[PDB]
Amino acid sequence: SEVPQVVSLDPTSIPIEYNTPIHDIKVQVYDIKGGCNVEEGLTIFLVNNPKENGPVKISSKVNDKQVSEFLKDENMEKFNVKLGTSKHFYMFNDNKNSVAVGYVGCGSVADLSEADMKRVVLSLVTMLHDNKLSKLTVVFEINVDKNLFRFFLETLFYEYMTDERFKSEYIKHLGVYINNADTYKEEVEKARVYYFGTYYASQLIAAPSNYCNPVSLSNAAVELAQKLNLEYKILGVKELEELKMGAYLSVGKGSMYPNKFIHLTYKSKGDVKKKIALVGKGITFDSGGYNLKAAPGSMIDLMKFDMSGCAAVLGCAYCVGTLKPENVEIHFLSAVCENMVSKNSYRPGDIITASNGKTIEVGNTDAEGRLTLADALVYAEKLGVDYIVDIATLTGAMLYSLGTSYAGVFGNNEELINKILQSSKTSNEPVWWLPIINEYRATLNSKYADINQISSVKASSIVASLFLKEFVQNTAWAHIDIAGVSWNFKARKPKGFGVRLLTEFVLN
Amino acid sequence: ASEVPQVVSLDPTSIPIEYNTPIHDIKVQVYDIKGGCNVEEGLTIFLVNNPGKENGPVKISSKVNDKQVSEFLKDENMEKFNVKLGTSKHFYMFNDNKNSVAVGYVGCGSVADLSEADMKRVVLSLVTMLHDNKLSKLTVVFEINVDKNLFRFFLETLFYEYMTDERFKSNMEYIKHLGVYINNADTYKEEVEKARVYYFGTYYASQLIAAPSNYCNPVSLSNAAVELAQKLNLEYKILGVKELEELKMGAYLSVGKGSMYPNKFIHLTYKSKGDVKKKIALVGKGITFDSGGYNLKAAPGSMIDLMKFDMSGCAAVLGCAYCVGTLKPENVEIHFLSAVCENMVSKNSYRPGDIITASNGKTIEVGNTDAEGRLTLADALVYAEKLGVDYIVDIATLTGAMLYSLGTSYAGVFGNNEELINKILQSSKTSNEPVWWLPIINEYRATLNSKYADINQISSSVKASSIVASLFLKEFVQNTAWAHIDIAGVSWNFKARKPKGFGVRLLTEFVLND
Amino acid sequence: SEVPQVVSLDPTSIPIEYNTPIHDIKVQVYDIKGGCNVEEGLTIFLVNNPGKENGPVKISSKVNDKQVSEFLKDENMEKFNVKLGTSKHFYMFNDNKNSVAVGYVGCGSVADLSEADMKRVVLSLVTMLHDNKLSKLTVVFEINVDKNLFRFFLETLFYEYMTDERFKSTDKNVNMEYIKHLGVYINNADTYKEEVEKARVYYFGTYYASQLIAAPSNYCNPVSLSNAAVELAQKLNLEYKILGVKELEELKMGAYLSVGKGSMYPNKFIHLTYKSKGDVKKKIALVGKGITFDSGGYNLKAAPGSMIDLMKFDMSGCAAVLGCAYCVGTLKPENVEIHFLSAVCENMVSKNSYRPGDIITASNGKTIEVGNTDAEGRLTLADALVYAEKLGVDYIVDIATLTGAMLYSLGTSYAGVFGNNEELINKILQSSKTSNEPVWWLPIINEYRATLNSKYADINQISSKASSIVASLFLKEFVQNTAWAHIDIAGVSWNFKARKPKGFGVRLLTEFVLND
Ligand SMILES: Cn1cc(-c2ccc([C@@H](NC(=O)C(C)(C)C)C(=O)NO)cc2)cn1
């Protein structure tokens, strides 16, 4: 629990913002019938033209003669609905009060994707960051179901928020105009919870590795557990040795921080009908070990992101603890360590023994993710759960298959894979099903060990999935590879990907 | 004097330093060429040219006091040789007293304006002969035009290239007399002992640089500095880790974390006996070894076997401390600063992505551990400005991009103050260590805007990393005139496989002519 | 003149747009003390706050409208800051009960804007112009600018506003409307009025160059490029001369001819001349590198980061000179004689290409050992510089996308200049100031010259790391007794942020020809 330091100036804690300015925002959802009021701050219409880059046209009645004049078709057709395009003008309303009115183009397609809506929100946020405002009002003149409306609110909150923990006025009111307002009102406070769970995971990932180490990260989990009345149990090296987790321990051999295993648990008040183990990869920094990330574009300055799996799990732990689902017992697991280069590091060629007895031949120390997951999975199955789900930044090959938008999911059970794909639909965190090709299993036949860590045959995501499959004997298990989608290179920040996906899974 | 840590007992605990050199035992005489040449003793060499005639024949003008040498130097004999720059011939013969003497020449081309590079090529041609000579005297006859500066440059270079470093070893013999015939001998006479001082400062810097990183570490180097300070009667102060932590030098301390050697901050000071009118802080990059950290120098041409040179900026500052402490300038106070450490790969190393806090409050996002020089300098520059000096001049092997811009002969100078830069450029002219002014382009500054930290250590996209590195350094000098010399391209002599000791004479000319 | 094709679908001419939308804009300048009239379109105030960083917006002009003045009272504007690049849109009704658009653009707290500062202001202005159908824009200058920065403002506003749609087919911007009127309110307006049409001239010269560069290598080839120079010269009534292979062979331009050996397009040497009616006091030769496509030759640009798909810009130097030719031919300076030169060819891989190791002979008789076929620019420039000196000129100014090393020395903003003459270099630097195309003086280091010594040829083509300096040393060997300057624009030519050419050099060359 005490964070070791090299010099006295080394941080001994991860700074965490719990109370965010978003939490202070009062949100009122009104129905568009009756007309819109424009009294103060910024009013933005979400408008499309079902044509391509067609003119803006406001449909909704506005209860203000000055703004109504500005919003008439003659003036608005000077602008167009190209997706992401925005304009906003400052003007005096009926009461001679200064108000800002504008729009965001929503393209020419009736139903926005999660990516389309994301670009819409970014255009909205840009205006929020450029204008000192007390209230934002958004008028929905487009078609949005409940799950996408919630996605809107979540994305709006996440992109509006600014991480200033390592640096050396927000709006206070949010108004939403939409048809069938009463049907959308329950999604607001759900969005605020999903928002923080994502932003919490974001804070952990964005936190540099000199801040976020196995000790400080485990301490953050305990702190979170105490705030949510979750049972918690942190496994130190002595215990892990007795549990014989030799794959996991080998990876952390080179670090100055001791291995720490995070085990958070949420139990429901009633009787439990489904037990779930969520496993997150928690590599606080991945230098690749003796297989150093030195190749061009290996992006070693990004590898603070390699505990994004753990972050998504902990962010999910927040959401579950806040929304309190019934009839479930959830175990939030993470084998947290650091992959470094030292005299104590494990070598390419080493043979290590996982807790289930399987000897593994290491071919590439930069493939450390599956090694720590191997022991976490064994530990997970020993809990006697119904579902084992792991989420991880496992393979760079994902950048070449699905890219930076869709995460991949692998598994041994079709029912479990389906529920995740369903969760992907409702959470709007896009995941695509990828196969485990058994014909590649033979490429993991070691000459000396029971199994190879890596292949000879490319397609590493499948091979890695084949490897992980060996450590789950008789339990429905799925594996989400988020190595490609975890980091937002355009915005230079994490996505907090996985939190809402995993929450929808536990809830729905 | 701190104890040097060891891994095995065979690890060295100090840098071997040669203080008394054979060069310090050569007696130098400067005669006027108008009176003829006395050629009865040792090797006599004529510096000649043939303006206009490219590779034209050799013709000796000087009357000599020997009938045997005179007949050898007659035009019929000498026109068998040409004056192509660097070309050399010398013959052994008997003088009128039947003594064994050696007579020859060195070609200086057909341009009546020998540059610094040409003069060095002439000197090297001379040194090659000296390295096979066993006579006790060398006489050089200047039948070419040189100014006082270029003449002192001739002596410095000669002294430096003549001397060979055998500290790590386990033919010829050094001359005891140097004769120089030249026009207005009386004026060039005062250049001799200035040259001998400039020589050793340069050679001292060369010894520190050339010494391998198992010999030259932060502990051994700071000890060597203390020893130099005591010999020059300079005030000195080595700042240790506990003090560095107190001063909150987080950027400096970060680089040194992965090393087995404790960080040591070298602070020497020269104060004039008279009233102080100028206050100068000289700052040198002092990375005893640069592996690159976790951004390990593994790429082709990363030249990691050279990386003992990464404290050349520090060596130049110390070599300057010798010259200044020896020549003792009036009315000036000089601070010699160098944040010394070692950039290694360990469990304790700082990582790519780490956000660290410099001593001035600014948080820095590390994008590349191999850009460690600007980090150590950042704290050195905050320290320097707290001293309240008028001028802060840093010199460093900072960016390898200098090899693609100015190359291996010219160093680059960046800065926030035009007058100070002009002062450097003037020091460049008189010291004959070439520097060229390069721009700090503020349009590139935005590339350092970090998403999380106060500022980025390096750029993501924008190349021309030298300009970017200056933009970074500029953030740690708040309202003092400051110049930055990047010697990453000129520090090492790849032809001779040795250091140049670049910067010692530049910095010294800077403080003397101030 | 006849452009060779492989298939009938291969283009035979560079599509060139002379009458651009910008040329249809009526530009009126008014003295700002005469009161601003706000009636139609969009009206933008260029505001700042000296000293107060992020200081409030204060409109200090006089507005001949009660309602707009009321809106622009300091009370209303306090909510907005003058942070450089920031803009806002206002909407109101004027005295004539007309709806009207008003706005501002922040210029920071500095009392005098740099070239980059003004370019930042202009870019914010164009954003307000994009995705908005306006019939008129009015710019009110509440910041101080000299004549040069004012002209630079207009130059930049025109260039960034204009969109190249020559190669758009099924994807033209259906909403791309251009303003028809431009109003400018400024102090001492009668001293700025002369700058307007000079800016319009300077605009097209830059955009003309931009069009040649942006045009791909199937459109812009040695023949189609040279034919475009002829067409320009005819419109400008300049003397023109296009040297073909037979002429080039008789002049023994082996270096230039070797470079084009592997191209399906014959070498074309562009020679344009402008002459003053009166006493010629200055003869100048402008030489631009004219490589329509740079594959690299057998030293193929195959390495990672070679940017072979960009190498259509390798005729940027040529375009800059032709852009300058337009400016000189239009502005018609006095007492000068200008020679616009460009040895145009294509560097390709073929059974006919020149090989690494080949020894070739320049038109001055010097033998050259080719060490790298991708260093083809200095080979063509060599013959071009000889042809230039034979014209008996006073100055030979050279411009070229010569070395990639510029990206590591000066980067993407500042071009480098080398030369054998202190005065000429200073004239270039002075022109860089007035034209606001940034240029830094870099040295020609004679110590490096020895590396160009060949065991067999008179001289080596390349050394065997300071490429830009070595390349200057090579070129210097082909100017015998004339003042010569060499501008390396390999790093500054392309605008990567906006994904388009800059048209760099045109204004700098023209200002050099004028201020002369
Ligand atoms: C966004 N991004 C992600 C990566 C990335 C690169 C490599 C890897 C993983 N490595 C791999 O997939 C290989 C098999 C070592 C190439 C890894 O280090 N797992 O612990 C995972 C992600 C690179 N960029």
Ligand SMILES: Cn1cc(-c2ccc([C@@H](NC(=O)C(C)(C)C)C(=O)NO)cc2)cn1
């Ligand atoms: C003569 N030579 C100099 C170098 C050299 C190479 C790299 C660097 C510096 N590195 C850099 O400039 C980069 C930007 C990391 C490539 C450096 O290590 N700073 O601490 C400095 C010098 C290589 N050869």
Ligand SMILES: Cn1cc(-c2ccc([C@@H](NC(=O)C(C)(C)C)C(=O)NO)cc2)cn1
């Ligand atoms: C913006 N950019 C410029 C380049 C560029 C790359 C290479 C070169 C030139 N080549 C060089 O400078 C070398 C010496 C071959 C590396 C060239 O091909 N000249 O004909 C010039 C420019 C690449 N990107």
Ligand SMILES: [Zn+2]
């Ligand atoms: Zn890895």
Ligand SMILES: [Zn+2]
């Ligand atoms: Zn990993």
Ligand SMILES: [Zn+2]
């Ligand atoms: Zn380094």
Ligand SMILES: [Zn+2]
């Ligand atoms: Zn270094």
Ligand SMILES: [Zn+2]
């Ligand atoms: Zn080329």
Ligand SMILES: [Zn+2]
């Ligand atoms: Zn080229």
